[PDB]
Amino acid sequence: GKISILVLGADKAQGGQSRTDSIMVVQYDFINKKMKMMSVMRDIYADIPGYGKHKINSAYALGGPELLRKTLDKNLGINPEYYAVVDFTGFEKMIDELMPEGVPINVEKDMSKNIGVSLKKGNHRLNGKELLGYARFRHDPEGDFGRVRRQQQVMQTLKKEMVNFRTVVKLPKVAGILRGYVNTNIPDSGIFQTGLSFGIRGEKDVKSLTVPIKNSYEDVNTNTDGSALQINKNTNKQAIKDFLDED
Ligand SMILES: CC(=O)N[C@H]1[C@@H](OP(=O)(O)OP(=O)(O)OC/C=C(/C)CC/C=C(/C)CC/C=C(/C)CC/C=C(/C)CC/C=C(/C)CC/C=C(/C)CC/C=C(/C)CCC=C(C)C)O[C@H](CO)[C@@H](O)[C@@H]1O
């Protein structure tokens, strides 16, 4: 009695090949009315069926959401039903259409390196370009680990700012905006049902999990992939199973 979605932030390399640099899984439980989200770090060193051990986000470049799903299932027991892929322009335009007033974000610190915008610490309303910049920043010692934290902060803010009667009343519009800028195989009745159930009768606390979990991984230098995360898959499989079954 649940729905699960593989949510991908994607972009183009200079050579034009597509890449995913943010991997999340969202599950909504229709019975218990509980929503959960997990971030899967893109640098996890994973067995990609057919291709050997590589950074897990290479599965998407090779075989799209289907191969990334199979790779998540084999390596982490994560097997989402649906997918939703968004690129830079889609993300920016989606935010600006959903929230023209801007998204209220407690910006962790001043940041501007490599994100094409200049953000100031503290509570600010960010447009699509700025919120994307906030989700992309990584040029500090925390690297991808701090980016995952800030991406989860963005998702929690979008949650708090969009689940309300003013938006659930506007679910048809919201859904049309999403399908125009998000590449997804969810049936549109499913966007409606999830929004209706969660927006009216869902628990407001959305619990989150970051994979790999603390003290289960190290950074290793790889032959052709470079900097990657070598993780204890079995320890992470058990944490994921524990996280997803009991609120
Ligand atoms: C910034 C930097 O330092 N860059 C340097 C660095 O490169 P890099 O690390 O790879 O980053 P890039 O620049 O390549 O950008 C790519 C980086 C990233 C993080 C890709 C980001 C792409 C995006 C589209 C942003 C993703 C944003 C977030 C918040 C993560 C979550 C993803 C998405 C798509 C959020 C989606 C939200 C929605 C409302 C749409 C959902 C649509 C649906 C149909 C599903 C709806 C149902 C649900 C249940 C949703 C969940 C529920 C709620 C309430 C939110 O290193 C190089 C060499 O060293 C340097 O050249 C370079 O300068």
Swiss-Prot record:
Native source organism of the sequence: Staphylococcus aureus (strain N315)
Family indicated by similarity: Belongs to the LytR/CpsA/Psr (LCP) family.
Covered range of the whole protein: 81 to 327 of 327
Extracellular topological segments: 1-247
Protein's name in the database: Regulatory protein MsrR
Top-level lineage group: Bacteria
Keyword Protease recorded: no
Keyword Cell inner membrane part of the UniProt annotation: no
Function comment: Involved in SarA attenuation. Affects resistance to oxacillin and teicoplanin, as well as the synthesis of virulence factors.
Main location: membrane
Cellular localization per UniProt: Cell membrane
Membrane topology of the entry: Single-pass type II membrane protein
Positions of disulphide bridges: none
Example of a GO cellular component annotation carried by this entry: plasma membrane
Keywords, sorted A to Z: Cell membrane, Membrane, Signal-anchor, Transcription, Transcription regulation, Transmembrane, Transmembrane helix
Name of the gene: msrR
